[PDB]
């Protein structure tokens, strides 16, 4: 199903930012490399541990990284030159979203920051509530349309914000606390919600996967799936990876269970991704498993290093390991 196309060691949960003729990848040690094909076009040293990235506009022209110390840096995607460097009151563990003239950042404090794309100035802030202990990591903000951004919160809610002002447009509860204790409160939506047409899906650490009809604002279903990873869709199936290492599929209109694969239990799975008519999910041994649409494993590609995130862009599957290895496959 997959043929290896590249295997690159990065100079020393970060995501690759694919470009039309290459890619941008950051090492957690601080080096952001812009690649043209398999050769380095540029490098930028952040002089700090990179905790969030690589964010990229849909036009492939500006890249964003967040550092452990709360710095947020915008880079020209072609040259690697910094456009601006600002310091926020909190660090980010997810890539920044670029929408319109805004860079939108989720942070440890629960604050969502709306930044001016040209200067990095803070235009707006939106505070979400965060339990004293929450699940480590966060969801990348998502542009619903030109005027609405969707935030997955540590409070288990989806927050819909006006892109220009930061004001809340609406919210929905997905993750549910089971009490006041530190374990019982854990309910993060740490996987970026999934939009297909006017339908919205999100899952949560506490075990709820909700499907929403954004046209009516109605809840279509709530099913059982504890997850910290982005969901994927395949025709009428919505599919996710559980915190137990299950891969499970639901009907994305009714919420009924389609299939559930237990072969990868406890392996530490990435988000599952859709590759054509197949599904791919990676694990902590560096193995990417390929599933058919009936949830049966038919193939396995192996890389070096633990995987936590898979990215599909056009025809290629991108994986960045914790060992700093970036692997690309085509399908
Ligand atoms: Ca979290
Ligand atoms: Mg998380
Ligand atoms: Na990266
Ligand atoms: Na690098
Ligand atoms: Na982005
Ligand atoms: Na962010
Ligand atoms: Na609803
Ligand atoms: Na998932």
- Which three-class secondary structure string do you get for the chain? CCEEEEEEECCCCCCCEEECCEEEEECCCCEEEEEECCEEEEEEECCCCEEEEEEECCCCCEEEEEECCCEEEEEECCCCCEEEEEECCCCCCCCCEEECCEEEEECCCCEEEEEECCCCCEEEEEECCCCCCCCCCCCCCEEEECCEEEEECCCCEEEEEECCCCCEEEEEECCCCCCCCHHHHCCCCCCCCEEECCEEEEEECCCEEEEEECCCCEEEEEEECECCCCCEEECCEEEEECCCCCEEEEECCCCCEEEEECCCCCCCCCCCEEECCEEEEECCCCEEEEECCCCCEEEEEECCCCEEEEEEECCEEEEEECCCEEEEEEC
**Both ends of the chain: CA-CA distance in Å?**
6
- Which ligand is closest in space to the CA of residue 109? 1
Find the 133 Cα to ligand 4 centroid distance in Å: 32
Find the 223 Cα to ligand 7 centroid distance in Å: 14
Q: How far is CA 30 from CA 9, 13, 48, 155, 304, in A?
A: 14, 14, 5, 30, 21
Find the 204 Cα to ligand 2 centroid distance in Å: 9
Find the 21 Cα to ligand 2 centroid distance in Å: 31
Burial status of residue 132 (CB atoms within 10 A of its CB: 0-12, 13-18, 19 or more): exposed
263 sits in the region (left: phi over 0; alpha: psi -120 to 50; else beta) called alpha
Find the 64 Cα to ligand 3 centroid distance in Å: 10
- Which ligand is closest in space to the CA of residue 226? 8
Find the 56 Cα to ligand 2 centroid distance in Å: 21
Find the 17 Cα to ligand 3 centroid distance in Å: 7
Find the 241 Cα to ligand 5 centroid distance in Å: 22
Find the 172 Cα to ligand 7 centroid distance in Å: 6
Find the 98 Cα to ligand 5 centroid distance in Å: 6
Find the 252 Cα to ligand 7 centroid distance in Å: 15
- Which ligand is closest in space to the CA of residue 107? 6
Domain with residues 1-331, CATH architecture: 7 Propeller (2.130)
Beta partners for residue 98, in sequence order: 103
Identify which of 137, 141, 155, 116 has the alpha carbon closest to the alpha carbon of residue 51: 137
Find the 126 Cα to ligand 7 centroid distance in Å: 21
Find the 219 Cα to ligand 7 centroid distance in Å: 4
Identify which of 171, 165, 227 has the alpha carbon closest to the alpha carbon of residue 200: 171
* Distance of alpha carbon 9 from alpha carbon 129, whole angstroms: 39
Find the 128 Cα to ligand 5 centroid distance in Å: 21
- Which ligand is closest in space to the CA of residue 217? 7
Find the 160 Cα to ligand 7 centroid distance in Å: 12
State the structure-solving technique: X-ray
The answer to whether 122 touches 84, Cβ cutoff 8 Å, is: no
Token pair belonging to 320: 């960045």
The answer to whether 72 touches 120, Cβ cutoff 8 Å, is: yes
Resolution in A: 2.3
Find the 318 Cα to ligand 4 centroid distance in Å: 15
Residues in the chain, total: 331
């Amino acid at each position: 199903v997959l043929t290896q196309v590249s295997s690159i060691r990065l100079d020393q949960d970060l995501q690759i930012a694919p470009l039309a003729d290459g890619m941008i990848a950051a090492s957690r040690s601080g080096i952001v490399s812009g690649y043209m094909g398999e050769s380095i076009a540029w490098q930028y040293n952040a002089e700090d541990v990179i905790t969030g990235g690589v964010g990229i506009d849909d036009q492939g022209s500006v890249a964003v990284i967040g550092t452990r110390s709360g710095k947020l840096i915008a880079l020209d995607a072609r040259t690697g030159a910094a456009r601006w460097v600002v310091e926020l009151a909190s660090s980010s563990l997810a890539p920044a979203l670029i929408s319109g003239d805004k860079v939108i950042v989720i942070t440890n404090s629960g604050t969502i920051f709306g930044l001016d794309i040209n200067s990095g100035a803070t235009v707006w802030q939106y505070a979400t509530q965060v339990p004293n202990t929450s699940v480590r990591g966060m969801a990348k903000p998502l542009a619903l349309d030109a005027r609405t951004v969707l935030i997955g919160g540590a409070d288990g809610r989806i927050h819909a914000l006006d892109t220009m002002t930061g004001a809340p447009v609406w919210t929905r509860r997905v993750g549910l606390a089971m009490g006041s204790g530190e374990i019982d409160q854990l309910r993060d939506i740490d996987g970026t919600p999934t939009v297909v047409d006017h339908y919205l899906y999100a899952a949560s650490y506490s075990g709820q996967l909700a499907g929403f009809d954004m046209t009516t604002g109605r809840t279509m279903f709530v099913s059982e799936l504890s997850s910290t990873k982005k969901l994927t869709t395949l025709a009428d199936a919505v599919i996710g990876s559980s915190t137990d290492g299950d891969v499970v599929a639901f009907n994305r209109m009714t919420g009924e269970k389609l299939w559930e694969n237990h072969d990868l239990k406890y392996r530490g799975l990435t988000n599952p991704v859709t590759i054509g008519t197949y599904i791919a999910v990676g694990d902590a041994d560096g193995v990417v498993h390929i599933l058919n649409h009936q949830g049966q494993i038919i193939s396995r590609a192996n890389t070096k290093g633990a995987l936590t995130n898979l990215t599909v862009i056009n025809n290629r599957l991108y994986a960045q390991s914790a060992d700093g290895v970036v692997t690309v496959w085509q399908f």
